[PDB]
Design an enzyme around this catalytic site. Structure first.
Site, PDB file in Angstrom:
ATOM      1  N   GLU B 370       0.733  -1.316   0.030  1.00 39.96           N
ATOM      2  CA  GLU B 370       0.033   0.034   0.130  1.00 39.96           C
ATOM      3  C   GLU B 370       0.856   1.157  -0.140  1.00 39.96           C
ATOM      4  O   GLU B 370       0.656   2.115  -0.679  1.00 39.96           O
ATOM      5  CB  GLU B 370      -0.960  -0.057   1.197  1.00 39.96           C
ATOM      6  CG  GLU B 370      -1.906   1.182   1.168  1.00 39.96           C
ATOM      7  CD  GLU B 370      -1.507   2.499   2.058  1.00 39.96           C
ATOM      8  OE1 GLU B 370      -0.341   2.327   2.426  1.00 39.96           O
ATOM      9  OE2 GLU B 370      -2.033   3.665   1.733  1.00 39.96           O
ATOM     10  N   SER B 571     -25.546  26.367 -18.878  1.00 39.06           N
ATOM     11  CA  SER B 571     -26.729  26.113 -17.901  1.00 39.06           C
ATOM     12  C   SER B 571     -26.550  24.919 -16.942  1.00 39.06           C
ATOM     13  O   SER B 571     -26.197  23.860 -17.771  1.00 39.06           O
ATOM     14  CB  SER B 571     -27.940  25.757 -18.556  1.00 39.06           C
ATOM     15  OG  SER B 571     -29.277  25.892 -17.813  1.00 39.06           O
ATOM     16  N   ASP B 607     -30.163  -6.657  -5.765  1.00 35.90           N
ATOM     17  CA  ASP B 607     -29.065  -5.964  -6.837  1.00 35.90           C
ATOM     18  C   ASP B 607     -29.389  -4.618  -7.684  1.00 35.90           C
ATOM     19  O   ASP B 607     -28.231  -3.948  -7.548  1.00 35.90           O
ATOM     20  CB  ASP B 607     -29.772  -7.166  -8.125  1.00 35.90           C
ATOM     21  CG  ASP B 607     -29.073  -8.202  -8.178  1.00 35.90           C
ATOM     22  OD1 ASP B 607     -28.157  -8.668  -7.105  1.00 35.90           O
ATOM     23  OD2 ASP B 607     -29.128  -9.113  -9.001  1.00 35.90           O
ATOM     24  N   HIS B 630     -15.560   7.178 -11.305  1.00 38.75           N
ATOM     25  CA  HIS B 630     -16.916   7.736 -10.760  1.00 38.75           C
ATOM     26  C   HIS B 630     -17.080   9.082 -11.017  1.00 38.75           C
ATOM     27  O   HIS B 630     -16.153  10.151 -10.939  1.00 38.75           O
ATOM     28  CB  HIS B 630     -16.704   7.501  -9.168  1.00 38.75           C
ATOM     29  CG  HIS B 630     -17.715   7.213  -8.483  1.00 38.75           C
ATOM     30  ND1 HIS B 630     -18.761   8.199  -8.226  1.00 38.75           N
ATOM     31  CD2 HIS B 630     -18.048   6.372  -7.586  1.00 38.75           C
ATOM     32  CE1 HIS B 630     -19.499   7.980  -7.462  1.00 38.75           C
ATOM     33  NE2 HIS B 630     -19.433   6.708  -6.952  1.00 38.75           N
TER      34      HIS B 630
HETATM   35  C1  MUD Z   1      -2.386  11.360   5.980  1.00 40.48           C
HETATM   36  S1  MUD Z   1      -3.288   9.984   6.477  1.00 40.48           S
HETATM   37  C2  MUD Z   1      -2.673   9.255   4.976  1.00 40.48           C
HETATM   38  C3  MUD Z   1      -2.714   7.480   5.217  1.00 40.48           C
HETATM   39  N1  MUD Z   1      -2.363   6.812   3.932  1.00 40.48           N
HETATM   40  C4  MUD Z   1      -1.143   6.689   3.493  1.00 40.48           C
HETATM   41  O1  MUD Z   1      -0.113   6.901   4.329  1.00 40.48           O
HETATM   42  N2  MUD Z   1      -1.250   6.211   2.129  1.00 40.48           N
HETATM   43  C5  MUD Z   1       0.196   6.186   1.671  1.00 40.48           C
HETATM   44  C6  MUD Z   1       0.133   5.862   0.279  1.00 40.48           C
HETATM   45  C7  MUD Z   1      -0.852   6.483  -0.563  1.00 40.48           C
HETATM   46  C8  MUD Z   1      -1.043   6.358  -2.067  1.00 40.48           C
HETATM   47  O2  MUD Z   1      -0.067   6.026  -2.609  1.00 40.48           O
HETATM   48  O3  MUD Z   1      -1.930   6.866  -2.582  1.00 40.48           O
HETATM   49  C9  MUD Z   1       0.694   7.548   1.725  1.00 40.48           C
HETATM   50  O4  MUD Z   1      -0.066   8.633   1.823  1.00 40.48           O
HETATM   51  O5  MUD Z   1       2.083   7.790   1.454  1.00 40.48           O
HETATM   52  C10 MUD Z   1      -4.158   7.176   5.752  1.00 40.48           C
HETATM   53  O6  MUD Z   1      -5.048   6.921   4.862  1.00 40.48           O
HETATM   54  O7  MUD Z   1      -4.154   6.666   6.963  1.00 40.48           O
HETATM   55 ZN    ZN Z   2      -1.256   2.787   5.818  1.00 40.16          ZN
HETATM   56 ZN    ZN Z   3       1.156   4.977   5.284  1.00 38.88          ZN
END
Ligand code: MUD
Ligand code: ZN
Ligand code: ZN
Ligand SMILES: *[C@@H]1O[C@H](CO)[C@@H](O[C@@H]2O[C@H](CO)[C@@H](O[C@@H]3O[C@H](CO)[C@@H](O)[C@H](O[C@H]4O[C@H](CO)[C@@H](O)[C@H](O)[C@@H]4O)[C@@H]3O)[C@H](O)[C@H]2NC(C)=O)[C@H](O)[C@H]1NC(C)=O
Ligand SMILES: *[C@@H]1O[C@H](CO)[C@@H](O[C@@H]2O[C@H](CO)[C@@H](O[C@@H]3O[C@H](CO)[C@@H](O)[C@H](O[C@H]4O[C@H](CO)[C@@H](O)[C@H](O)[C@@H]4O)[C@@H]3O)[C@H](O)[C@H]2NC(C)=O)[C@H](O)[C@H]1NC(C)=O
Ligand SMILES: *[C@@H]1O[C@H](CO)[C@@H](O[C@@H]2O[C@H](CO)[C@@H](O[C@@H]3O[C@H](CO)[C@@H](O)[C@H](O)[C@@H]3O)[C@H](O)[C@H]2NC(C)=O)[C@H](O)[C@H]1NC(C)=O
Ligand SMILES: *[C@@H]1O[C@H](CO)[C@@H](O[C@@H]2O[C@H](CO)[C@@H](O[C@@H]3O[C@H](CO)[C@@H](O)[C@H](O)[C@@H]3O)[C@H](O)[C@H]2NC(C)=O)[C@H](O)[C@H]1NC(C)=O
Ligand SMILES: *[C@@H]1O[C@H](CO)[C@@H](O[C@@H]2O[C@H](CO)[C@@H](O)[C@H](O)[C@H]2NC(C)=O)[C@H](O)[C@H]1NC(C)=O
Ligand SMILES: *[C@@H]1O[C@H](CO)[C@@H](O[C@@H]2O[C@H](CO)[C@@H](O)[C@H](O)[C@H]2NC(C)=O)[C@H](O)[C@H]1NC(C)=O
Ligand SMILES: *[C@@H]1O[C@H](CO)[C@@H](O[C@@H]2O[C@H](CO)[C@@H](O)[C@H](O)[C@H]2NC(C)=O)[C@H](O)[C@H]1NC(C)=O
Ligand SMILES: *[C@@H]1O[C@H](CO)[C@@H](O[C@@H]2O[C@H](CO)[C@@H](O)[C@H](O)[C@H]2NC(C)=O)[C@H](O)[C@H]1NC(C)=O
Ligand code: MUD
Ligand code: NAG
Ligand code: NAG
Ligand code: NAG
Ligand code: NAG
Ligand code: NAG
Ligand code: NAG
Ligand code: CA
Ligand code: CA
Ligand code: CL
Ligand code: CL
Ligand code: ZN
Ligand code: ZN
Lengths: 691, 691
Positions: B370, B571, B607, B630
């Site tokens: 992550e 609009s 669904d 989205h």
């Molecule tokens: C500032 S809180 C951010 C924290 N998230 C992360 O640290 N994610 C990592 C990786 C996120 C990414 O690459 O999108 C980062 O921000 O470096 C969380 O969501 O708890």
């Molecule tokens: Zn994290």
């Molecule tokens: Zn992190």
């Protein structure tokens, strides 16, 4: 009882005939008042026949029409600019229609305006390989030339694209008797052949699945934002016009320069078929001049959408659709199909009035503007894509019911092969000599599969009809069926001409309407089984068999380049692995489907069957063709009518020996092998146990 | 009985504590052996806890690591090229860990290599508006400068993108005590503040949802075709390195040129915060020099995927996921979340061993990588997108359970608002002063909604965590919840530093593990209701209310430009119309859902609920961001952590008064209004009666 037999027995040849007559007395060109009136008529009749709801869905899309007070034509022009020969301003109308108004004269829909003058080059069918032969082998340069090509073999939009990329400044399309006059049959009104004054209308777009040129991705509704013309999708950049073979003879007879390279380039006219640049010595100073004044115009179109709500699964849609707009009278195309749909609706409505309802919802559609690029079906699908994506079981198309009287023709997804084989074994053959025999038997005898003994030919779906958005964009299992001739992509002789009339059909194609009736049984029968069978009538093992054949085929194409496959390490192992896995998983899924009272397991399993075609969709689309998203099938990049299997790999391999950076070209082949193997594996995994 | 109470009562603070300790004794950096070992441990334990199947799903993705024998650092370099000051090579390790090996030193993951030397410009937080102020108002040119920016306010990848587009040749990120040292609390190990030697690690990619930089769209499996580095997605083109505030003080203290434009540009260090170019007179000839030698390396990562098969709807998936890889010890991030997931799995497994099964299938995930760009969750979702698209009910994220000890924080889709309100009314508040009161009561008191009285704040989902692929790419209803502080996007003080340890949590955040327990109840409770409720616990009317608020908001932004809205006929009527229709249809759907023994109607209706989030997906994606699909929510183009509503229209309006061709810019605003109105209407239509 209310079973398929009840449905099928209610269908009547006599009703199909009456409807065909009714739909073909006046032209029903898309965007005209006459076609809106017919829309309203069908809407009223479908209501009377018993459907739950029947609505018109309208859109404002780009259409194209000649200028009524400034006619299109082509001239041979002498040295002083005198026009010494002019092509016809209209097709001679057939007997009894010489006073019909609003017959649109022959034109190429979406041609830009222009009056280009130049020397002719004759390009045979204007296929990719025809242009390769001219440019590579004969060293003939088309730049700034007017090209003249005979219709046939491939979609006309591909011809125009190919001429444009060769640098042509205009294109003249004509019908050669070699392709449109069958030996030993008389010209219309005395037989089904094309007369020398006859001309084939048709659009020359290259939309690649986009729908309305101005609104790719989104329905052309009331608040839609439109691209400007210069950013429209698919429009040709050079003028184009079609002519008959009396006129073509006059343009071709004077041709000089090089001889035709071989006999596959010679049609049946009494001319040399010289490839040119320009005319022979005496006439070397005469030129050809086009005059094209058609205009593109945003115009309202109307689809009729009828619903017969399902009794058990109303949120599962089985769709029977075909178009209603015609170039002129539409005697075969589309009204022989529309009359069939009308009688199917009537028959289902009869059962419904007796208290029956299908298990799933059946939707019936009379599409508009098919002739201008599948516009009506595509805009509607764009509007409803979320409903169709999550609820669409299958789409059965219903354009022309006949293009010959020889045997059945079916093109469909492998998921429907077993359904088609089974249904046709239960239907009577209409053929002479097969009385009391099944349709399956006559069809298999007359049209044997090239792979399988004792099996009939079933082709892949290509495009050039309203199933394109449902199958290639949305991944909904689709099929089509009609009676056909003993070739394939050129059209029957009177295709898109003013001579395609009710009389053409009643006199020369199907006097007893028994082939129409047989087609109504096949299309209606398919819809009935799809909408009523407790287990969806798809067999995933048939997809496995075909995937292996396509993998063998694309591998064989690559293996024409063994040295490059060594240098760049090009392996098909992942794709064969995926196909093997799909075969294994599909076998196990089939066992569970046979071996499983539980409506959740059933519908779980019906969802796995319904979403299997869906799994072949890649949301990123094919390279530069974002609306062709099915990884197994796309319309051929060289011929929209034809299907291509593993199109992403096929197109990456095509003419690869000509690419300037082989490393990059072979890298892209490998990329497309990865995408195909991954998608096959992912599709297989949707058939695994769910948890 | 086996009901939610049974599930919730089985959860124990003491177990969460034991697991947190167990997960935080050594570093678990993505792609390292230690993290693979922990993967295998979790896989074994989830099996023992009772899940039906627990597998590792592995991928080979681009990761980035410092060169162990060639350390990264920054210098001030005098006129002769002597390095007179060097930044630290590592953070001083905390007590008792000074002999732990394999602590990765601070670095910016994915920085290219380089040794750029130049004059410093200080750019505050390096936000879009910070660069506007420098370039437009102060006329300071960053071209060929090294920029120094303080962390905080926005995702660091946005800072680097903004510096790159300003023409910077390097970026230095540092933690200012103004943002990372709370008044009156001691530095770690004696409190929870950041010491001056502490440094925040983190990646600086701009992937916009792509996942592995080398394989956008497709899983990085064994046969995957990879882009070359030069075509990789999201990589920065200039070197980047983070430092602590002792080091930053030394770089900033000499700064000359212009004064800070105002006090919002001054942090808490005893320096002037001059914006520069370069140093004051005495030092005008000293330069700053970076030395970055990190390398990008394709490396294997491992997700653990556990399944608890549903008893009634095994083909409907409710997913609880959070990551396992950490920058160092991961005491808060992610292990406070992972320990919570582990205890949830244990509790569900206890019920399962007593013969219970949830109605729907629950999937549990321990994601890898992550920290390097959401790589593990994204590659897995790419591999399984067809299953998730057609079967995904909801995704609940489970990263850090705590970032403070003040109150609850929830960010989720409007579809889950009612579920969250109801669940929190049934849970006990852990807060001092609210003993015997509900969590809802304490949360609403401490974090009031700015729109609604007597309602708690619930934020939109942004990004920067593993729900991104599920929500913004695939359109699966998603949520997250944690305990938080009384700001939002900067991180708690010891975020991504070596000081984020078990002791940090046990001593200063949650000694009794009661906030962890409360978070386990909220996340686990949500999963339980989603997986077990007969009718899915989504309320479409809550989406209607929020859509109107977002429509008002985007309209208000446009109305800052009344003259242009007149000139270009801009609009918002279609969008308000769509929102009105959605409100009306959702009201009727809600009545049927309340007013409908019929499992088909039920599941039809479930669904419709499951596919409602799905309906906001546009398969063409947002402009130049094809993986943000989205239409209602996307990560802010200026700050990945923050959500933006109507992002396509928002981005078309942003800074529009600066565009050179206003006709074209306003045309694009109108195009995005059309897309948003159409998608809202289409989503509404999925809630209409199906036939
Ligand atoms: C500032 S809180 C951010 C924290 N998230 C992360 O640290 N994610 C990592 C990786 C996120 C990414 O690459 O999108 C980062 O921000 O470096 C969380 O969501 O708890
Ligand atoms: Zn994290
Ligand atoms: Zn992190
Ligand atoms: C068809 O279905 C089969 C399942 O029946 C599926 O088989 C899988 O193939 C993959 C790719 O070959 C296997 O991946 C291996 O996984 C092991 C761990 O399980 C890894 O250690 C392997 O990596 C080592 O070896 C590689 C190849 O030499 C090296 O490149 C690498 O550096 C490692 O040293 C490798 O990743 C996977 O285990 C099986 N899964 C099974 C048997 O369940 C096959 O992929 C399917 N076909 C397609 C096209 O999906
Ligand atoms: C919200 O839901 C409502 C349904 O309750 C839906 O209303 C629809 O609005 C459209 C667009 O305004 C209507 O479209 C009209 O349809 C009639 C035929 O039914 C046409 O004749 C109209 O065209 C004429 O008028 C236009 C406008 O002045 C001209 O531009 C045009 O040239 C024609 O002269 C027009 O197309 C539609 O009838 C209703 N449908 C109903 C009431 O059922 C509305 O669109 C929904 N909102 C969104 C954003 O989808
Ligand atoms: C087209 O028709 C063929 C021939 O009827 C259909 O195949 C047959 O389908 C039935 C019903 O599933 C199969 O019966 C099953 O057999 C197994 C015994 O091995 C048993 O376990 C089940 O309870 C059931 O009786 C039958 O074997 C099968 N015949 C074949 C494949 O030769 C086929 O399904 C039809 N295709 C459609 C409707 O799409
Ligand atoms: C959160 O909890 C609230 C309060 O319990 C839930 O709303 C309530 O849901 C029930 C069950 O649908 C509603 O009862 C229904 O009332 C109508 C009478 O008008 C009747 O026709 C039905 O047979 C049924 O009794 C109740 O009205 C409703 N209360 C409200 C909205 O104030 C809500 O559903 C929960 N949200 C979830 C579970 O996502
Ligand atoms: C095609 O058939 C339709 C329906 O039978 C005919 O339309 C009907 O015509 C009569 C006489 O004008 C009217 O009273 C009805 O209101 C019409 N019914 C409709 C439109 O639903 C139509 O005349 C036929 N067309 C041709 C060329 O024969
Ligand atoms: C082909 O058609 C063109 C256009 O109508 C004819 O040329 C015109 O002839 C009229 C009457 O003599 C002149 O007034 C126009 O100036 C001519 N127009 C152009 C564009 O040349 C031409 O005579 C026709 N050719 C043949 C062989 O019938
Ligand atoms: C975290 O907990 C796990 C599981 O209790 C510990 O792993 C076990 O360790 C013992 C002693 O080495 C082994 O006999 C077991 O086989 C392990 N179980 C597994 C891996 O499932 C692990 O030691 C703990 N880690 C720390 C740092 O305390
Ligand atoms: C900052 O670190 C650099 C690099 O290690 C030091 O400069 C080196 O000093 C050694 C020993 O005198 C020399 O042999 C190298 O040639 C130098 N390298 C470079 C790149 O300049 C420098 O002394 C350190 N500065 C401070 C203030 O400690
Ligand atoms: C040559 S048979 C083709 C016939 N299809 C069509 O005529 N389609 C029309 C429009 C097709 C298109 O625009 O894709 C055409 O080919 O001009 C059919 O499918 O029956
Ligand atoms: C049709 O042609 C005539 C002559 O140019 C002209 O009056 C009219 O503008 C044309 N109609 C169009 C371009 O739609
Ligand atoms: C074809 O002729 C044109 C026209 O002058 C020229 O520009 C072009 O390069 C030629 N191409 C070839 C292949 O000779
Ligand atoms: C109908 O069938 C006969 C007999 O084979 C054939 O000769 C005739 O030309 C057919 N009609 C058409 C239009 O093909
Ligand atoms: C790490 O640095 C040393 C010095 O350049 C070198 O031997 C080695 O190549 C580097 N490792 C890399 C680039 O992965
Ligand atoms: C910024 O400075 C660079 C470096 O010479 C120059 O090329 C660029 O045009 C400058 N931009 C502005 C806005 O002055
Ligand atoms: C925990 O709560 C107390 C009391 O409000 C607060 O002062 C303390 O700093 C909190 N700990 C953290 C890390 O916020
Ligand atoms: Ca469109
Ligand atoms: Ca990928
Ligand atoms: Cl057809
Ligand atoms: Cl989280
Ligand atoms: Zn047709
Ligand atoms: Zn046609």
């Amino acid at each position: 009882k209310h079973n398929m037999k009840a449905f099928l027995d209610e269908l009547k040849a006599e009703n199909i005939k009456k409807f065909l007559y009714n739909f073909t007395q006046i032209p029903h060109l898309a965007g005209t008042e006459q076609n809106f009136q017919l829309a309203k008529q069908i809407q009223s009749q479908w209501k009377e026949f018993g459907l739950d709801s029947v609505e018109l869905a309208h859109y404002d899309v780009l259409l194209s029409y000649p200028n009524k007070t400034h006619p299109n034509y082509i001239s041979i022009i002498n040295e002083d600019g005198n026009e010494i020969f002019n092509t016809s301003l209209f097709e001679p109308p057939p007997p009894g229609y010489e006073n019909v108004s609003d017959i649109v004269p022959p034109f190429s829909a979406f041609s830009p305006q222009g009056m280009p003058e130049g020397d002719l080059v004759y390009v045979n069918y204007a296929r990719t390989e025809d242009f390769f032969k001219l440019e590579r082998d004969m060293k003939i340069n088309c730049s700034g030339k007017i090209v003249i090509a005979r219709y046939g073999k491939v979609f006309r939009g591909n011809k125009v694209k190919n001429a444009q990329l060769a640098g042509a400044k205009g294109v003249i399309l004509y019908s050669d008797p070699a392709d449109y006059f069958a030996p030993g049959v008389k010209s219309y009104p005395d037989g089904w052949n094309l007369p020398g004054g006859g001309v084939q209308r048709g659009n020359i777009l290259n939309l690649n699945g986009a729908g309305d040129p101005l609104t790719p991705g989104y329905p052309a509704n009331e608040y839609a934002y439109r691209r400007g013309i210069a950013e429209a999708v698919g429009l040709p950049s050079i003028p184009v016009h079609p002519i008959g073979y009396y006129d073509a003879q006059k343009l071709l007879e004077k041709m000089g320069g090089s001889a035709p390279p071989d006999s596959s380039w010679r049609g049946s006219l009494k001319v040399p078929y010289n490839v040119g640049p320009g005319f022979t010595g005496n006439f070397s100073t005469q030129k050809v001049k086009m005059h094209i004044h058609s205009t593109n115009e945003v115009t309202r179109i109307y689809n009729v959408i009828g619903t017969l709500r399902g009794a058990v699964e109303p949120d599962r849609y089985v769709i029977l659709g075909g178009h209603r707009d015609s170039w002129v009278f539409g005697g075969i195309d589309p009204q022989s199909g529309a009359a069939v749909v009308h009688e199917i609706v009537r028959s289902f409505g009869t059962l419904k009035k007796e208290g029956w309802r299908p298990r799933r919802t059946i939707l019936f559609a009379s599409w508009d503007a098919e002739e201008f690029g599948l516009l009506g079906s595509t805009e509607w699908a764009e509007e409803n894509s979320r409903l169709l994506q999550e609820r669409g079981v299958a789409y059965i198309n219903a354009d022309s019911s006949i293009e010959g009287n020889y045997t059945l023709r079916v093109d469909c997804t492998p998921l429907m092969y077993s359904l088609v084989h089974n249904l046709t074994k239960e239907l009577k053959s209409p053929d002479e000599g097969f009385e009391g025999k099944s349709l399956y038997e006559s069809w298999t005898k007359k049209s044997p599969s090239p792979e399988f003994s004792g099996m009939p030919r079933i082709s892949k779906l290509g495009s050039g009809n309203d199933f394109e958005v449902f199958f290639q964009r949305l991944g909904i299992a689709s099929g089509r069926a009609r009676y056909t001739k003993n070739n394939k992509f050129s059209g029957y002789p009177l295709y898109h001409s003013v001579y395609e009339t009710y009389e053409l059909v009643e006199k020369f194609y199907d006097p007893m309407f028994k082939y129409h009736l047989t087609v109504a049984q096949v299309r209606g029968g398919m819809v009935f089984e799809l909408a009523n069978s407790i287990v969806l009538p798809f067999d995933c093992r048939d997809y496995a068999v075909v995937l292996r054949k396509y993998a063998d085929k694309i591998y064989s194409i690559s293996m024409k380049h063994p040295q490059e496959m060594k240098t760049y390490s090009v392996s098909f192992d992942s794709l064969f692995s995926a196909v093997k896995n799909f075969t294994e998983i599909a076998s196990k899924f089939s066992e569970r489907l046979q071996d499983f009272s539980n409506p959740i397991v059933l519908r779980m399993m019906n969802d796995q069957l319904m979403f299997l075609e869906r799994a072949f969709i890649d949301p990123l689309g094919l390279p530069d063709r974002p609306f062709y998203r099915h990884v197994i099938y796309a319309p051929s990049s060289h011929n929209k009518y034809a299907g291509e299997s593993f199109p992403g790999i096929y197109d990456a391999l095509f003419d690869i020996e000509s690419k300037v950076d082989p490393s990059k070209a072979w890298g892209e082949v490998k990329r497309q092998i990865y995408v195909a193997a991954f998608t096959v594996q992912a599709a297989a995994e949707t058939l695994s146990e769910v948890a």
